[PDB]
Design a protein around this ligand. Structure first.
Ligand SMILES: CCCCCCCCCCCCCCCCCC(=O)OC[C@H](COP(=O)([O-])OCC(O)COP(=O)([O-])OC[C@@H](COC(=O)CCCCCCCCCCCCCCCCC)OC(=O)CCCCCCCCCCCCCCCCC)OC(=O)CCCCCCCCCCCCCCCCC
Ligand SMILES: CCCCCCCCCCCCCCCCCC(=O)OC[C@H](COP(=O)([O-])OCC(O)COP(=O)([O-])OC[C@@H](COC(=O)CCCCCCCCCCCCCCCCC)OC(=O)CCCCCCCCCCCCCCCCC)OC(=O)CCCCCCCCCCCCCCCCC
Ligand SMILES: CCCCCCCCCCCCCCCCCC(=O)OC[C@H](COP(=O)([O-])OCC[N+](C)(C)C)OC(=O)CCCCCCCCCCCCCCCCC
Ligand SMILES: CCCCCCCCCCCCCCCCCC(=O)OC[C@H](COP(=O)([O-])OCC[N+](C)(C)C)OC(=O)CCCCCCCCCCCCCCCCC
Ligand SMILES: CCCCCCCCCCCCCCCCCCCC(=O)O[C@H](COC(=O)CCCCCCCCCCCCCC)COP(=O)(O)OCCN
Ligand code: HEC
Ligand code: HEC
Ligand code: HEM
Ligand code: HEM
Ligand code: HEM
Ligand code: HEM
Lengths: 244, 383, 85, 54, 244, 383
């Protein structure tokens, strides 16, 4: 296949979480949630994430309850069996922008914006692909490229023509921690956030892995000593043969 | 008389794990058998646990796997352990089979354990294929579709058989629910066959790297091979740890994190890496039925090694030409694997056909010729 | 405590001659009517008490208990029920 | 009897072939017989008996 | 427990389907469907039965398609993702009178009318219980019985006080086959129909059972002959002992 | 040498089903072992098939069982076969255990097969209990609730253990999904223990109705007991046919056709009939923990029969007093069963306590006394 059909391969960026012993940067995760909420969430759902999931990762219990309580969710029917709404709770999932696929496609010139909860695992490249894609819209398509109507040129996307236009521009978000919201900064934060959404066990997993590595290595060393100890009578055996 | 010998139940365990007389010179390639038993125990423990949280219905399957990853305590570990151990199982089984081929473990009097071994290998393939479908991601669905459509090649009844396997007209809910039931069952069948091949082996005992009798010099299985097995157990657990904790998705396909969609076809539909050489063999034959036969023959041809090996000596340790041929055979098998996942494009189409011919010609031509000539060189060379 | 054919663990046998005839030479249902009537009657008569006595006792116990329970939950059994609880 | 024995019974290959062929015949004839008997004992009751009204 | 707490036990009526070799009477099943549709279906659902299930049991393909096509079912959303309705198809399930439990209870003074698809298996007595209950409302409760509000006396119902009033009265239905629609006739037909709804394999099952009984009995007889044949050398063995 | 004897795999089969030396006088009560093997095979075949169509999620479980009854070809048969064979399994296991108790099969040298047998019986109970929950009808839920709450009686940790079993704070979806995985597993464990008790038996061979050695007079297992087993197989299949085709719900509870409702409690919650005697024993002790201990002890006490039977003679064929005591013990066991399903009302409360005392006093007092006296009567009476 041509390189265009594959898509350009994203650079390997030095993410804070790259590194056997490295967690996510939680300040970046929190900023990335704010980019998601103010930019991506207009078209993209995050359906696998509940409000409780933010708590003690990016937000306190109170902040997350406040986010949940601002929304309305379907309650159980009332006593006459009529539909009712209730305010959100921490157990609720973050609600998506569209009621169904048909509505999503209608709002996006036929294209369906994927749910972003697993996107960092569902694409080769992970965070690097998300960062490269969001920051990789050239001002002008390479001469000779014919885009289908409603497509935008992006070399990272396979085939080059993506239905999502560029959305991150300097200062579309005002971060609450005073960080300059440049295109690059926002793409980095949201790519970190989405990586966390895909693999929220990441930090715990790598710490447990460190404990396992240490114990298993020591056991490997001791198992070598013990095997050699037990085998030495066999290895050291000597023979004298006197032919009968 | 010691209880371990007197009591019939204890004596069965004793005969296999304690007093079992082993050659004193088994090298580390004799440790893959216990690693395979370890993989089987991990897969049973993790598999039964995933079954407690998984839902086989197509509307819930993919989400039940996300629930395992996200909500079940240590669910991420149990899931990644199960998924990665499936790959480790195939690395160990290829190593165990390669050991057997290099050292002549298929020769008399060990034809029967080898032949039951070939069936174990087929059951492992089926088990792993069905388990991969259970995720119900894009690769799950599309891999089930293309692999199950190979059955359509069976003359006359092939289409009917496919609809019967699917329980409908395409891969859907009925297929997923039956794959769950069979995926749960097949590891128990596999454990029975693994036990059968060991009982069959017990009549001759283990072969050894020199290819000679060990009846002159035996060691108890315990403590010597118990403690030697611990070294490779911990080496295996270190590799396991590096994948499961530090790179849990290295061996997987990102498309399996997209929910199955019968409309959209993924860019490239490939089997899991361990099935790739057989897929390359199938692509090499242009005919559908031809390709299926070749692919099955590539496994069943292992059954003729006892016949086509004409050597008067067991194993390759002392056979320089056989050792070179074996090296080329193994590397060709890896190249077939690589060709199973390239695009059907020049020049890989022809290369795949040449590698397929080499694969079969090892069994049918080269090993019979080389083993004949080496017999003569040993005789003339030592006169 | 059991060997196998040829060394089963029997004390030495001597002095017994055993005889039988082919299944094709015999009538498999020879004497069936006599057996079915007289042999079954003998075998059943000799075991009858060991079944009848416990069955009849436990059936009587049940019958008395179930009848009392039924009576206690009628109008007539109101007072006796009140005492029983 | 000798002839019958010699052709159908003496060789087990022939005996098994005869048993399987008889099983095939039995299966097809028994199906038809039960279907007719079932229809006679349940006459006027089954859908096939009232279908003509509709 | 008191007899009242148990409920009176229904008589054993001689149903056509009683009898190892007996099917349902399908003319009664068809009439029972009509009672269901015109009386019971106001309060009771039959959710496990699809229109296709009636076909070749009580109705032809065309009659059942006509019943389905008169109703509206929820379709997939249109292209703007707005809800749509479609006409019914044979694959559709028979729709219930109420959208949820709360609406059902609101319409029935708090009582919830059960779904009737399994009722013949879900009550001791089966058809006899349904027939007895429907026909067993006395004009006046036995002297001394105090009914809770919204309850009706019926001795077959455990405790006596049922939230369902009598509904079958002579001529509430006009049968299409000219049968006099008395209380007893309608109760018999609807009880037959509901028994069919609970166990629609009934007729096929009992015929397959007849084939199994015949084959298995013959095999039992032959197995006795063969066992006796093979055992006769052992049974017939005789001994002569000459003590050494 | 014949192949069946020479080849080690064939020789294992040969030793159990063909050349196996049997007493020549086994009566029809020695046929329950093969009926139990038949039930186990039917339950595996029907159970794995139901697993292909069943959904373990609490939102879909009960409906998946209705889909089996209504839509799956022959689903009604597979479901009713599985449900009724569970009852037949218990009839055969009670007959097999009663045979063992009457004929002294638990005595030396058969203590080990008997003791493993007691564990098989416990695994059957657990298997059947979990399978009944899978329907998720009213009896499924409420039986799981009541039985799992008995674990709360374990001191200190009981409550914690219950929440751990349920995977939540009441019986719900997590409990159903775990019961499905374990219900699938437990029959395979049960098959292994069934095989273990046969291997343990093979050292002494089958006992026989006279209680004497059969080493003097052995018959091959095949053809004699193969053909004698066919008679009871066909008798079993006739009983199976009458229930499965003509009365499929006779052995069941109508409330299990109502979907589980955690709010409404059914009129009476009883276990399936085969657990009823143990339930009556539990009711007899007023204390919760006392009752659980008694109920478990009622099964584990079978382990002491080898000790408390003081007879110098094996089995009851020639012991008139032991035969009467055995008759009363069996009928009392049936009365306990009946009392397990009556209401907790007079006079059944006291009667249940008397029957419970009789149950335990058989093992602890009566059998040791009666067997002692009969020893003396045999000796004095034959002087
Ligand atoms: C996956 C799960 C993890 C578990 C890992 C288990 C793997 C262990 C194993 O079987 O291999 C170790 C194994 C060491 O086993 P060993 O029992 O010491 O000797 C086995 C050989 O037969 C002895 O072979 P040798 O004595 O002739 O020594 C040959 C070996 C040198 O082997 C030494 O270890 C030295 O060096 C090479 O063959 C390298 C080839 C040259 C490349 C340049 O390593 C090899 O020898 C690998 C050679 C394969 C090609
Ligand atoms: C469930 C699945 C269905 C499969 C059916 C399997 C049942 C077969 C079985 O074990 O019982 C047949 C079994 C016949 O077995 P058999 O090998 O002829 O004799 C075993 C005894 O030695 C027979 O003891 P016996 O020779 O002393 O003869 C006594 C027997 C007469 O035994 C018969 O031949 C009948 O009659 C009675 O004991 C009747 C009790 C008196 C009530 C009045 O019948 C009985 O023994 C019933 C008596 C049990 C009380
Ligand atoms: C890649 C190519 C491998 C070729 C091996 C050639 C022999 C060699 O150097 O190996 C070292 C050793 C040589 O050991 P050896 O036992 O022959 O000799 C020991 C030393 N002397 C001769 C002095 C007694 O070979 C092994 O240990 C071979 C085991 C083969 C395992 C293959 C796994 C491949 C999986 C694919 C499955 C299909
Ligand atoms: C109900 C009470 C039954 C008691 C049986 C008493 C003996 C008798 O008459 O039986 C006939 C026969 C007598 O057989 P027998 O072997 O003692 O005598 C044969 C005949 N003579 C004496 C001439 C050699 O007993 C059996 O076959 C008994 C098997 C017991 C099975 C019980 C199942 C109950 C399950 C409850 C589980 C806990
Ligand atoms: C699992 C449960 C096992 C018990 C089976 C009993 C009956 C089930 C058979 C199904 C059935 O209804 O068959 C009927 C006939 O029964 C019969 O004639 C079957 C009774 C036979 C008893 C057992 C004989 C062998 C069965 C087991 C062997 C299976 C594997 C071996 C290869 C009629 O059905 P139908 O006649 O309409 O059927 C179409 C062919 N005309
Ligand atoms: C108003 C529309 C819109 C906004 C705003 C938007 N997207 Fe998208 N996005 C889409 C559409 C439409 C597609 C589907 C494009 C296609 O498949 O052609 C898409 C696709 C994607 C993809 C997948 C591309 C692929 O490989 O399939 C990722 C990742 C993505 N968006 C992330 C984001 C992030 C991160 C943001 C903002 C911070 C964002 N999107 C903002 C409309 C939007
Ligand atoms: C307008 C209301 C209404 C009509 C009409 C009606 N039912 Fe009911 N039915 C109920 C209610 C309410 C209950 C629940 C009563 C209770 O549990 O107290 C019920 C309960 C039942 C029960 C179960 C009683 C039990 O054992 O739990 C059966 C069977 C039944 N109905 C059948 C029918 C049949 C058959 C018809 C008509 C041919 C019918 N019903 C007509 C309201 C109705
Ligand atoms: C030889 C043993 C086994 C092998 C090789 C094996 C292989 C696999 C594979 C490859 C998958 C796909 C994993 C993924 O990518 O997510 C899988 C999934 C699964 N397996 Fe197994 N398996 C085995 C034994 C078992 C057993 C005994 C069970 C018991 C039920 C089981 C239950 C499951 C379940 C529920 C899943 C789906 C959830 C998931 O994907 O993790 N497996 N198996
Ligand atoms: C579940 C998969 C398997 C397990 C658990 C297993 C286990 C074992 C074990 C423990 C041994 C004895 C120790 C050893 O030599 O390594 C062994 C020997 C053997 N296995 Fe396997 N095995 C499996 C699959 C296979 C396969 C697929 C084959 C053949 C294609 C095979 C063929 C043999 C042979 C021929 C031997 C004898 C080798 C010798 O000692 O010379 N096995 N196996
Ligand atoms: C000793 C073997 C077994 C016993 C005693 C047993 C017992 C039971 C029982 C009592 C039920 C409730 C039946 C009902 O009322 O509907 C049940 C249900 C079930 N069993 Fe088993 N079972 C056994 C083996 C198996 C096996 C091996 C499987 C394999 C998965 C299995 C799968 C099921 C399934 C899916 C259900 C639920 C569907 C239904 O209720 O019919 N069973 N089992
Ligand atoms: C899955 C359940 C079981 C199966 C398939 C099974 C199968 C068998 C078989 C085939 C035999 C040899 C033939 C016979 O005597 O009937 C046997 C013997 C025996 N079984 Fe079981 N059994 C099971 C459960 C049990 C249980 C629960 C016990 C004890 C509590 C038990 C104790 C014994 C004993 C003691 C013997 C030797 C009896 C003798 O021949 O004297 N078994 N069993």
């Amino acid at each position: 296949m041509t390189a265009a059909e594959h898509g350009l391969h994203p650079a390997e960026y030095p993410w804070p979480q790259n590194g056997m012993l490295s967690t996510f940067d939680h300040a970046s995760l929190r900023r990335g949630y704010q980019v998601y909420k103010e930019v991506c969430a207009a078209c993209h759902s995050l359906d696998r994430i509940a409000w409780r999931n933010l708590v003690g990762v990016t937000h306190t219990t109170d902040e997350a309850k406040a986010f949940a309580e601002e929304l309305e969710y379907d309650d159980e029917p009332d006593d006459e069996g009529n539909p009712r709404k209730r305010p959100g709770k921490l157990a609720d999932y973050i609600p998506g922008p569209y009621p169904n696929e048909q509505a999503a496609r209608a709002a996006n010139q036929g294209a369906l914006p994927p749910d972003l909860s697993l996107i960092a695992k569902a694409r080769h490249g992970g965070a690097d692909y998300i960062f490269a894609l969001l920051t990789g819209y050239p001002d002008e398509p390479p001469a000779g490229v014919v885009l289908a109507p409603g497509m935008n040129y992006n070399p990272y996307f396979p085939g080059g023509g993506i239905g999502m236009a560029r959305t991150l521009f300097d200062g579309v978000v005002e971060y609450e921690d005073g960080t300059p919201a440049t295109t690059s900064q926002m793409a980095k934060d949201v790519a970190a956030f989405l990586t966390w959404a895909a693999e929220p066990e990441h930090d715990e997993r790598k710490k447990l892995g460190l404990k396992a590595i240490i114990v298993i290595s020591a056991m490997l060393g001791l198992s070598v000593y013990i095997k050699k100890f037990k085998w030495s009578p066999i290895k050291n055996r000597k023979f004298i043969y006197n032919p009968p | 008389m010691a209880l371990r010998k007197k009591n019939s139940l204890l004596n069965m365990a004793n005969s296999y794990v304690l007093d079992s007389p082993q050659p004193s010179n088994l090298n580390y390639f004799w440790n893959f058998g216990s690693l395979l038993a370890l993989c089987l125990v991990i897969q049973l423990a993790t598999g039964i646990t995933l079954a407690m949280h998984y839902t086989s219905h197509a509307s819930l399957a993919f989400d039940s796997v996300e629930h395992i990853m996200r909500d079940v305590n240590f669910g991420w570990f149990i899931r990644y352990a199960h998924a990665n151990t499936a790959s480790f199982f195939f690395i160990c089984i290829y190593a165990h089979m390669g050991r057997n081929i290099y050292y002549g473990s298929y020769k008399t009097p060990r034809v029967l354990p080898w032949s039951i071994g070939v069936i174990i290998f087929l059951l492992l393939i089926i088990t792993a294929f069905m388990g991969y479908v259970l995720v119900f991601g894009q690769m799950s669905l599309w891999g089930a579709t293309v692999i199950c459509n190979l059955v359509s090649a069976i003359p006359w009844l092939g289409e009917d058989i496919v609809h019967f396997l699917w329980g409908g007209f395409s891969v859907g809910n009925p297929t997923l629910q039956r794959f769950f039931a069979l995926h749960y069952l097949m590891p128990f069948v596999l454990a029975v066959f693994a036990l059968l091949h060991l009982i069959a082996l017990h009549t001759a005992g283990s072969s050894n790297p020199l290819g000679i009798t060990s009846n002159v010099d035996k060691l108890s299985m315990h403590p010597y091979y118990s403690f030697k097995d611990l070294i490779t157990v911990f080496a295996f657990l270190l590799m396991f740890t590096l994948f499961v904790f530090f790179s849990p998705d290295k061996l997987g396909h990102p498309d399996n994190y997209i929910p199955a969609n019968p409309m959209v076809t993924p860019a490239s539909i490939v089997p899991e890496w361990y099935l790739l050489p057989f897929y390359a063999i199938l692509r090499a034959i242009p005919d559908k039925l031809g390709g299926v036969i070749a692919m099955v023959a590539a496994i069943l041809i292992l059954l003729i090694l006892p016949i086509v090996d004409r050597s008067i000596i067991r194993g390759n340790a002392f056979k320089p030409i056989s050792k070179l041929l074996f090296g080329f055979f193994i590397c060709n098998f890896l190249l077939l694997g690589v060709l199973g996942q390239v695009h059907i494009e020049p020049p890989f189409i022809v290369l795949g056909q040449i590698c397929t011919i080499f694969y079969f010609s090892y069994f049918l031509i080269l090993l019979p010729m080389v083993s004949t000539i080496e017999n003569i060189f040993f005789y003339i060379g030592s006169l | 405590y059991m060997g196998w054919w040829g060394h089963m663990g029997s004390p030495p046998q001597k002095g017994i001659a055993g005889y039988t005839i082919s299944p094709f030479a015999a009538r498999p249902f020879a004497g069936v009517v006599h057996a079915a009537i007289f042999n079954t009657f003998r075998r059943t008569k000799n075991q009858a008490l060991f079944v009848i006595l416990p069955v009849s006792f436990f059936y009587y116990v049940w019958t008395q208990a179930s009848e009392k329970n039924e009576w206690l939950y009628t109008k007539a059994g109101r007072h006796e029920l009140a005492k029983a609880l | 009897a000798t002839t019958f024995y010699n052709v159908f019974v003496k060789r087990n290959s022939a005996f098994v072939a005869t048993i399987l062929a008889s099983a095939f015949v039995f299966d097809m004839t028994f199906e038809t017989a039960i279907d007719n008997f079932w229809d006679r004992i349940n006459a006027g009751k089954q859908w096939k008996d009232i279908r003509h009204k509709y």
